[PDB]
């Protein structure tokens, strides 16, 4: 399977929808060359709306499955998406904030790769994905995997600071969240370098976007006093 569980775990109807998506996306491909595969795929997508959504979710799950298949299916999704995958991004948000407790590590890495691809490509609505993924970071915890995930999304945001600049509210969300992470994190030399990177980025955002930081609220001062 994809999500870690056992026999006693409830049969998750969302996961069964994902399994049906696996069935249709894989069995329709049948290991043929990508040309006829995407031809038939576009036919099935344009047949109707629910099957279009099913194909999109199948492509999304394939992006979480295997690296080469993730590359090919992300290519096919960008090629065949009709509405720009906005409701697909909505379902991505739902699956993310609901099933992150059970998500496998390889699926986590491939989902992070998909998030980086979406941010770099500048697909509309990526700000929502960024801020809901940001929301899942638990404060006051020192788990290695969570800290690695925080560092990875921080790297994504730093390389695409201009995409943050064009997203007005995301500036405030990111700076506040990274201040909270700063007051949370300390103890190790790697955490010290991470602290340096975070404080440099936050100071740069605060100076360059002071007017945008005005609407954060008085809790900004609360974070300031501790650092």
């Amino acid at each position: 399977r994809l999500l870690l569980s056992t026999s006693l775990d409830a049969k998750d109807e969302l996961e069964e929808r994902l399994e049906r998506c696996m069935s249709i996306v894989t069995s329709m491909t049948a290991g043929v060359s990508e040309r006829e595969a995407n031809d038939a795929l576009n036919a099935y997508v344009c047949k109707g709306l629910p099957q279009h959504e099913e194909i999109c979710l199948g492509l999304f799950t394939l992006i979480l499955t295997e690296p080469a298949q993730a590359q090919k299916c992300y290519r096919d999704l960008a090629l065949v998406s009709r509405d720009g995958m906005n409701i697909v991004l909505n379902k991505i948000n739902q699956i993310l904030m609901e099933k992150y407790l059970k998500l496998q590590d390889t699926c986590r890495t491939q989902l992070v790769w998909l998030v980086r691809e979406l941010v770099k490509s500048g697909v509309l609505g990526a700000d929502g994905v960024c801020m809901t993924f940001m929301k899942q970071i638990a404060g006051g915890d020192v788990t290695a995997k969570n800290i690695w995930l925080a560092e990875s999304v921080l790297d994504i945001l730093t390389e695409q600071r201009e995409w943050v600049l064009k997203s007005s509210i995301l500036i405030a969300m990111a700076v506040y969240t990274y201040l909270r992470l700063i007051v949370d994190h300390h103890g190790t030399a790697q955490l010290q370098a991470l602290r340096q990177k975070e404080v440099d980025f936050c100071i740069s955002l605060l100076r360059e976007r002071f007017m945008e930081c005005l609407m954060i609220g008085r809790d900004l001062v609360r974070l300031l006093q501790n650092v």
Binding site: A78, L79, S121, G122, L124
Partner: peptide, 14 residues
């Protein structure tokens, strides 16, 4: 190719 395609596509949806 695909990167350029979708980077051009986001303009279409603007």
């Amino acid at each position: 190719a695909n990167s350029a395609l979708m980077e051009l596509d986001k303009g279409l949806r603007s």
